[PDB]
Amino acid sequence: RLPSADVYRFAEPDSEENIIFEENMQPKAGIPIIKAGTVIKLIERLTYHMYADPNFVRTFLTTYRSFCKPQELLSLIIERFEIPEPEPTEADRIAIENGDQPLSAELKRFRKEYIQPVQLRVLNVCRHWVEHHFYDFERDAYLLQRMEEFIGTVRGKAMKKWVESITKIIQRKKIARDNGPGHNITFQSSPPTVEWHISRPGHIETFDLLTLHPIEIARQLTLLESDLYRAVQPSELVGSVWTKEDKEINSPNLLKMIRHTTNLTLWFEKCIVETENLEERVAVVSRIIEILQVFQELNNFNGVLEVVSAMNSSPVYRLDHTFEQIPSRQKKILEEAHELSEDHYKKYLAKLRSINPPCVPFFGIYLTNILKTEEGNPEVLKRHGKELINFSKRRKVAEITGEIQQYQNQPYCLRVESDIKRFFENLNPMGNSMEKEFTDYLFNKSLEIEPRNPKPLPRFPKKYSYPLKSPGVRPSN
């Protein structure tokens, strides 16, 4: 029936030396769930003759980079396509030598019941690859040449529509190379006016924390973070690519999210500790809590928990004389914001699963859970002396990426202000410093502005030449 191992590797039999399945679920579901296997066995079951497996295709193509390179994958699926057909029977040879057509009964069967199935499943994998994962081919024009040489040498009536589907996707993605962004945008309620404060509209030189409006700070950062959140692809997280040695190649949108998070959070800390006058620093902290209010009103959980991160920082959290003068209202607001994180993020996930769109989810819990998954599961399971790729680990990370992805569909009914947007895109509080040494700077600055117990607090001069009373978090209705 099936071909032999000396001509075709994807016809080696299943064993505990080559595949492990999950026994959780599946009491003869038809399709088993692979816990682990060799890459050959994974590719085989990705392109199986008995069944299509679209959930495995998606999960595989999101994650394969943790176990297999693009060029290796393309070689493997092409090898899977190249099935050896059987030789004729002795009677069919006799028919051929007589000048007649052979009956060809097993060959006709094997084509219909093995080859065609596997080959159409290979094309299904290729089609999913060029649609949802085209960045591999954007990063590798030789990979694209190989794919297009493959797809354009496929022969057969049965393969025609798949080849045409794949090539239309490849051509459409080639247009995307020079096109880029556009306006789409699911937005439904009426948007507000842009709110303005000490900064006169367009006078970018004047823009600061206390001079832009706190509602508008929150709304433009929410617009920004919504776009940053929505730009991260699933595959950028698998293997923790942001902490591999090709991060700035292969985590482009992910590092932009991470760096924004760092720059805004350290900018809040910087704003606080470099205001050495206590009374001004209360105004700073109070304004950041008002930005947190508007983040809470917008359901930008990412912006809430960035302020939580700044206020719980070593430099800021010890500034007891500042927080003593923050009113009980704003203290309750920070307490409730901290409570989002308490008990493993219990209140966060309960709130997130009960609010209505739009939102920006907190991004850093997903990174944390992916790292816990990465550090807590082996890359290979050992069986019988052989090492099998832990695909259950990859499925676990892929599941977490889908919990991100379900919220990437929901932009805001907020008006963009392009100068405030560009201002916040260009935050760099550290400058030429690095994070650790900058936060040690900020901690030393904290100890300057509020010294420790038996050294009394000195009086420092003002730095703001402008009114420090906020306009408030209520809009100009």
Ligand X SMILES: Cc1c([C@@H](C)Nc2nc3c(c4cc(=O)n(C5CCOCC5)cc24)CNCC3)cccc1C(F)(F)F
Least CB distance to ligand X at residue 312 (A): 4
Nearest residue (CB) to ligand X, 325 versus 444: 325
Q: Single out the residue of 317, 409, 422, 457 in contact with ligand X (rule: CB under 6 A).
A: 317
- According to CB under 6 A, which residues from 47 to 66 bind ligand X? none
Nearest residue (CB) to ligand X, 337 versus 370: 337
Nearest residue (CB) to ligand X, 47 versus 261: 261
Least CB distance to ligand X at residue 319 (A): 8
Least CB distance to ligand X at residue 473 (A): 17
Check binding of 318 to ligand X (CB under 6 A): no
Binding part of the chain for ligand X, among 25-33, 65-73, 89-97, 328-336 by CB under 6 A, reads 328-336
Least CB distance to ligand X at residue 354 (A): 21
Three-class DSSP labels, the chain: CCCCCCCCHHHCCCCCCCEEECCCCCCCCCCCCEEEECHHHHHHHHCCCCCCCHHHHHHHHHHHHHCCCHHHHHHHHHHHHCCCCCCCCHHHHHHHHHCCCCCCHHHHHHHHHHHHHHHHHHHHHHHHHHHHCCHHHHCCHHHHHHHHHHHCCCCCCCCHHHHHHHHHHHHHHHHHHHHCCCCCCCCCCCCCCCCCCCCCCCCHHHCCCCCCCHHHHHHHHHHHHHHHHHHCCHHHHCCCHHHCCCHHHHCHHHHHHHHHHHHHHHHHHHHHHCCCCHHHHHHHHHHHHHHHHHHHHHCEHHHHHHHHHHHCCHHHHCCHHHHCCCCHHHHHHHHHHHHCCHHHHHHHHHHHCCCCCCCECCCHHHHHHHHHHHHHCCCEEEECCEEEEEHHHHHHHHHHHHHHHCCCCCCCCCCCCHHHHHHHHCCCCCCCCCHHHHHHHHHHHHHHHCCCCCCCCCCCCCCCCCCCCCCCCCCCC
Tokens of 347: 């209140």
Q: Single out the residue of 118, 326, 352, 371 in contact with ligand X (rule: CB under 6 A).
A: 326
Tokens of 82: 């190249």
408 close to 363: Cβ distance less than 8 angstroms: no
Nearest residue (CB) to ligand X, 253 versus 312: 312
Least CB distance to ligand X at residue 272 (A): 11
Least CB distance to ligand X at residue 435 (A): 16
Nearest residue (CB) to ligand X, 57 versus 292: 292
One character per residue 280-309, x = contact with ligand X (rule: CB under 6 A): ----------------------------x-
Nearest residue (CB) to ligand X, 239 versus 303: 303
Least CB distance to ligand X at residue 139 (A): 39
Nearest residue (CB) to ligand X, 120 versus 288: 288
Least CB distance to ligand X at residue 211 (A): 24
Least CB distance to ligand X at residue 309 (A): 9
Nearest residue (CB) to ligand X, 362 versus 391: 362
Least CB distance to ligand X at residue 334 (A): 4
Binding part of the chain for ligand X, among 186-194, 311-319, 375-383, 428-436 by CB under 6 A, reads 311-319
Q: Positive or negative, the Cα torsion across 291, 292, 295, 296?
A: negative
State how far the Cα of 350 lies from the Cα of 361, in Å rounded to an integer.
12
Q: Single out the residue of 228, 311, 381, 473 in contact with ligand X (rule: CB under 6 A).
A: 311
Nearest residue (CB) to ligand X, 259 versus 331: 331
Binding part of the chain for ligand X, among 103-111, 137-145, 179-187, 331-339 by CB under 6 A, reads 331-339
Nearest residue (CB) to ligand X, 321 versus 462: 321
Q: Single out the residue of 203, 244, 259, 331 in contact with ligand X (rule: CB under 6 A).
A: 331
Nearest residue (CB) to ligand X, 142 versus 317: 317
Which amino acid is residue 172, in one-letter code? R
Least CB distance to ligand X at residue 322 (A): 9
Least CB distance to ligand X at residue 285 (A): 8
Long-range contacts of 183-186, Cβ-Cβ distance < 8 Å, separation of 24 or more:
185/411, 186/409, 186/410, 186/411
State how far the Cα of 92 lies from the Cα of 96, in Å rounded to an integer.
6
Q: How many residues bind ligand X (CB under 6 A)?
A: 11
Nearest residue (CB) to ligand X, 74 versus 333: 333
- According to CB under 6 A, which residues from 332 to 351 bind ligand X? 334-335, 337-338
Torsion of CA 228, 231, 232, 234, to 10 degrees: 150
Binding part of the chain for ligand X, among 175-183, 237-245, 327-335, 406-414 by CB under 6 A, reads 327-335
Residues forming the site for ligand X (CB under 6 A): 308, 311-312, 317, 323, 326, 331, 334-335, 337-338
